[PDB]
């Protein structure tokens, strides 16, 4: 059985880390986990009350991209995201992008799923691989969105 702990996802050069939220206290310990898993880039996508810089003063690129609880990612957000991944994995391959949010199994995993699909993983496999590592995965809408999604397919 498990704690309230991070969850890493890989393939191919891509490595993600879906996480919990810190309060400002935990925040030194939180940034320690991050550095361990080799993350360069955190993407907030729910709101969090911790005040980031300490994570930035440690040189992790933080991104505040909140979207609606339960929703699929807005169009931009998805564009930014894919575009973000290209540059960040180009910067140093096999590093980690962290995504974090209060639940852990709603919208954060979607970005990740999106990534794998747009990177050639069967939609079905994508959902299963995510649900393997965190169970509960997504909601109907999250899943609708995921099936209906069509890779360009765009990820150099």
């Amino acid at each position: 059985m498990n704690r309230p702990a991070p969850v890493e996802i890989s393939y191919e050069n891509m490595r993600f880390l879906i996480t919990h939220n810190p309060t400002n206290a935990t925040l030194n310990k939180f940034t320690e986990e991050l550095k361990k898993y080799g993350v360069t880039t955190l993407v907030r996508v729910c709101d969090a009350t911790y005040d980031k810089a300490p994570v930035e003063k440690e040189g992790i690129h933080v991104l505040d991209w909140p979207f609606d609880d339960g929703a699929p990612p807005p169009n931009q957000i998805v564009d930014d995201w894919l575009n973000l991944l290209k540059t960040k994995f180009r910067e140093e391959p096999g590093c980690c992008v962290a995504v974090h949010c209060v639940a852990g199994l709603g919208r954060a995993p979607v970005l990740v799923a999106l990534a794998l699909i747009e990177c050639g993983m069967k939609y079905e496999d994508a959902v299963q691989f995510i649900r393997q590592k965190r169970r509960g995965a997504f909601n109907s809408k999250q899943l609708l969105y995921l099936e209906k999604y069509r890779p360009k397919m765009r990820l150099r």
């Binding site: 059985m1 704690r3 609880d69 199994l105 709603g106 169970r135 997504f138 909601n139 999250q142």
Partner: protein
Amino acid sequence: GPLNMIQGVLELRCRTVEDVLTPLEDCFMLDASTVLDFGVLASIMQSGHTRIPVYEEERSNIVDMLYLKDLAFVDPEDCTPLSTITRFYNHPLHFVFNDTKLDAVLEEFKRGKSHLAIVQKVNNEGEGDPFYEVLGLVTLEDVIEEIIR
């Protein structure tokens, strides 16, 4: 008797934590913000629990486990807050899915330090993202009770 117990062990593989659990409202639990005065300590010892869930700021948000051992040199007045104590030890906290078969939980409990997991089911109703809903606690006792009746 011996035959019931035999049925009980055999039924482990069919029944689940949900059947055996202890709902949240019926568990001894502590508010993180509590202060360890004579009364609350007494309360603790009188609980006859040796491992007590600590929540904030509502019982389903379980943030920490308080072990009895943790109370060792705390002096009532000084009037120490419960969170200073919890913050002395990262005691891990075990979550189990409501679905899990008892025979499995038996094994987990043997294969760990723990004699109590917090029970969770994923929850799909609502617009929001899925979440884990804390149902309450299952203990090693709860599972033994299954067998010795």
